[PDB]
Amino acid sequence: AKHEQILVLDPPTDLKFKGPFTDVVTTNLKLRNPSDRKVCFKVKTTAPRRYCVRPNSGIIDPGSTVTVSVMLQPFDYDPNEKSKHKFMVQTIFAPPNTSDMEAVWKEAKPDELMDSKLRCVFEMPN
Numbered sequence: 001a002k003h004e005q006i007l008v009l010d011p012p013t014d015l016k017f018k019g020p021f022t023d024v025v026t027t028n029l030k031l032r033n034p035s036d037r038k039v040c041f042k043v044k045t046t047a048p049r050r051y052c053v054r055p056n057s058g059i060i061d062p063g064s065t066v067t068v069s070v071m072l073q074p075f076d077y078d079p080n081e082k083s084k085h086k087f088m089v090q091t092i093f094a095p096p097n098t099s100d101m102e103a104v105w106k107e108a109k110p111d112e113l114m115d116s117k118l119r120c121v122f123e124m125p126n
């Protein structure tokens with residue numbers, strides 16, 4: 001059975017980016033690990049040329065939290081266009097050996113992976 005996402009995300013669903021978008025706009029995403037085990041994570045967007053994410057991967061200690069910076073590139077914003085961009089978080093419980101994360105993610109069984117999706121929202125100041 002594919003488990004639910006073990007991490008607690010703040011914000012849990014909607015990532016908001018406040019304009020104006022003539023500059024780089026950054027929004028934070030906190031990943032909290034409420035379990036007693038290390039959790040490896042990977043964070044991606046559906047538009048890699050417009051977003052950067054730092055860090056895009058790592059391991060979270062039990063009970064700890066990491067802040068992920070999502071950077072939106074400047075663009076010409078039209079208020080009558082909603083953002084169709086999604087943000088994927090993929091997590092897996094860390095195996096004992098994590099010195100080779102490429103091998104860890106590749107050996108991962110399908111049900112060992114946990115996934116969360118966040119929607120993006122563009123907004124201007126009031």
Ligand SMILES: [Cl-]
Binds near residue numbers: 015
């Ligand atoms: Cl939310």
Ligand SMILES: [Cl-]
Binds near residue numbers: 035036037
């Ligand atoms: Cl646990």
Ligand SMILES: [Cl-]
């Ligand atoms: Cl880079």
